[PDB]
Structure 1
Amino acid sequence: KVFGRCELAAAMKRHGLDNYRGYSLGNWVCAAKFESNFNTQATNRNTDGSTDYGILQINSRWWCNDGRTPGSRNLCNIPCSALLSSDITASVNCAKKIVSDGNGMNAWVAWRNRCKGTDVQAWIRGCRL
């Protein structure tokens, strides 16, 4: 599913991301825009042989099992295909473990390079929240 911006903001707020570990909702919408273009089906192979999955590009080296990332962890205890669903529950629950892991939202390279330190409140402008 390709989300609209305010559609995704509403879903991420519904599931508890707004101000989670002190990251305002616009940080999460910005991250999803530049990680996945708001597409739950997005996949991207990494040079280490892992893959990033879904709306928040969650990595198979640490967080999910994709059957082809040797020696990798599965800390969210889910198949990586679960992170491609139109239902973002699994992605959000896993993102909450990732952002709690020690480096905060710096786990999302697109957030660090394109959202961090910017006017992230612009990403929820005009949305009914």
Structure 2
Amino acid sequence: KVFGRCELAAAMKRHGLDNYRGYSLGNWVCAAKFESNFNTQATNRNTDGSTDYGILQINSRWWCNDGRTPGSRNLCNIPCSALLSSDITASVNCAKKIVSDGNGMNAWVAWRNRCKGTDVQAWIRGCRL
């Protein structure tokens, strides 16, 4: 599914991401925009042979099992395919473990390069929440 901007903001707020570990809703919407273009079915292969999955491009090296990333961990205890669903629940629950691990949202390269230190409130402007 390809989410609209306000539609995704509303789904993320319902799932407890607004100000989760101090990150306002704008931060999560901006990250999803530059990571996946709001497409739950986005996949991208890394040079090390791991793969990034879903709306927040969660990496098979640490977070999910895809059966083809030898010697990787499965720290969210899910198949990577569960992260491609039109229901964002699994992506959201795994994202909360990632942002809690000590590096905050710096775990998402596109957040660090394209969202951090910008006016992120602009991403939720005009939405009914």
Give TM class, smaller chain. Answer: over 0.9
Q: Give the ranges of 4+ consecutive aligned residues of structure 1 lying more than 6 Å apart after TM superposition.
A: none
CA displacement at 1:27 relative to structure 2: 0.1
Consecutive unaligned residues of structure 2, counting only runs of 5 or more, are: none
CA displacement 1:66-95 (0-9 Å, x = unmatched): 000010000000000000000000000000
CA RMSD in angstroms comes to 0.3
CA displacement 1:37-63 (0-9 Å, x = unmatched): 000000000111100000000000000
Instruction: Give TM-score, length-normalised by structure 2.
Output: 1.00
Distance of 1:89 and 1:41 partners within structure 2: 14
CA displacement at 1:28 relative to structure 2: 0.1
Partner of 1:97: 97
Aligned residues: 129
Consecutive unaligned residues of structure 1, counting only runs of 5 or more, are: none
Partner of 1:72: 72
Distance of 1:48 and 1:113 partners within structure 2: 21
CA displacement at 1:14 relative to structure 2: 0.3
Distance of 1:87 and 1:126 partners within structure 2: 24
Partner of 1:62: 62
Distance of 1:38 and 1:71 partners within structure 2: 30
Secondary structure of the residue aligned to 1:49 is coil
Distance of 1:126 and 1:73 partners within structure 2: 40
Distance of 2:83 and 2:22 partners within structure 1: 24
Secondary structure of the residue aligned to 1:52 is strand
Distance of 2:32 and 2:56 partners within structure 1: 5
Instruction: Give TM-score, length-normalised by structure 1.
Output: 1.00
Distance of 2:124 and 2:47 partners within structure 1: 33
